[PDB]
Design a protein around this ligand. Sequence first.
Ligand SMILES: CC(=O)Nc1nnc(S(N)(=O)=O)s1
Ligand SMILES: CC(=O)Nc1nnc(S(N)(=O)=O)s1
Ligand SMILES: O=P([O-])(O)O
Ligand SMILES: O=P([O-])(O)O
Ligand SMILES: O=P([O-])(O)O
Ligand SMILES: O=P([O-])(O)O
Ligand SMILES: [Zn+2]
Ligand SMILES: [Zn+2]
Lengths: 238, 237
Amino acid sequence: AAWNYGEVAGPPTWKGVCATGKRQSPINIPLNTSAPKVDAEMGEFDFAYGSFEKCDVLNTGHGTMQVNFPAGNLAFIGNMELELLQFHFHAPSEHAMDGRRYAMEAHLVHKNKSTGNLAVLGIMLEPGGLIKNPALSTALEVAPEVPLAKKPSPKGINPVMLLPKKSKAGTRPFVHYPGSLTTPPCSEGVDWFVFMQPIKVPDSQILDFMRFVGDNKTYATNTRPLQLLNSRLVEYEL
Amino acid sequence: AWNYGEVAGPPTWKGVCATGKRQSPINIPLNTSAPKVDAEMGEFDFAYGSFEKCDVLNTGHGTMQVNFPAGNLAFIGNMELELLQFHFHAPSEHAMDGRRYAMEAHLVHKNKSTGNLAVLGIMLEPGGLIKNPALSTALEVAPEVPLAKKPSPKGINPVMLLPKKSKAGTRPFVHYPGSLTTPPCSEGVDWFVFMQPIKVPDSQILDFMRFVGDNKTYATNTRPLQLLNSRLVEYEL
Ligand SMILES: CC(=O)Nc1nnc(S(N)(=O)=O)s1
Ligand SMILES: CC(=O)Nc1nnc(S(N)(=O)=O)s1
Ligand SMILES: O=P([O-])(O)O
Ligand SMILES: O=P([O-])(O)O
Ligand SMILES: O=P([O-])(O)O
Ligand SMILES: O=P([O-])(O)O
Ligand SMILES: [Zn+2]
Ligand SMILES: [Zn+2]
């Protein structure tokens, strides 16, 4: 006969824009493509994440924990101003780079003060890290095991720590594209910025997270399959 | 109200897979308020070679599969089990008081007394500071092409996939009648599950999850827990 373990059963049954939209996330992000690449001409991100003491850690009942920030944490790119709302994680990564996913993907979700949209910053987490990632760590420690339950972090959580390090040219290369939320209702009009430089992380933390995703009784994943690019193009700021 | 869910594959599996009342894996109650019936079976005695020349196969269903020659014998309850092959599942397929471990190793045997299959399950825990060399070689030698096999250059010591003897010289375990955990999910299999996990490095658990994801993602290859039904788990603690 013919059989597999297959993928998680839920995502191909999500309704509304999840099924109908044509600007859905995530997507494959070509790198080693011969195909020529539209430059984003947006310049480089600058971060003003200061108001990061006093955080809530929330158990979404959807695998990941969610760190909620108070107003005042700002990032700038192009002329646009981005106010940080929350961050969370996916394992394995949601976006892919030439077909290949990573151990985790961090999602920093912002209100886009300039467009009225949301903007999601996306960072790849790789295994190999010698230092625990402090933001990830605290998110792991504080996160209520009871689902739906949220409780305030006693430690401060610096979300800049989820950003890749600057290159040997001042930059943090990224791709930009219009897409959606990767969970229901998958609303569109989200600006996606996926950085190309992964951050290394001790394997303990990746297993700790997949453990959290598995209700602390197994190891599990919380990722959506890749979606068609369709009419879009991806903008590179390499 | 929406979710990611469990993998979509196993609930569709047909045959005995879907109809059997004696299926694996199951939950192994330890700290329960129910009486534990002792298996009274004695302890395992292992005579496994230390540097076996093995074929490593890519099952094309997640795990690689290490095949052995004859000579690797496990003795229990006055029976002779011979090792056919090992492979892995991530997370563990058995649970223990509801909880699964990072991986489970399955050492499959032919009961030479009976001719029926027996499987030994060992939990693999993260935390380990020492690379387990059997899992290591199995990851290294595993052919990339599905259903292909390649002989290993290095010997494999399958005893490395078994837990150390305790302070009292035991390797406590549980015994129950079950099935293959993959189609045809044939029943009549004797399951022995060791209570003591082995620590392996987090690197290797991830390597394995990577293999299951065919080097492009991180996946699992575990069947969901089954109902004990009318069955009894017997204990050798
Ligand atoms: C209010 C809000 O931020 N909702 C989100 N839903 N999904 C997100 S994701 N995984 O696509 O970044 S963010
Ligand atoms: C021939 C044979 O042994 N087939 C098996 N299929 N699944 C196995 S498991 N995971 O239940 O040990 S063994
Ligand atoms: O090889 P590592 O990146 O899993 O330590
Ligand atoms: O050879 P063993 O069964 O004592 O390890
Ligand atoms: O069978 P033994 O020699 O390991 O006790
Ligand atoms: O190193 P640990 O935290 O995975 O046991
Ligand atoms: Zn997300
Ligand atoms: Zn198995």
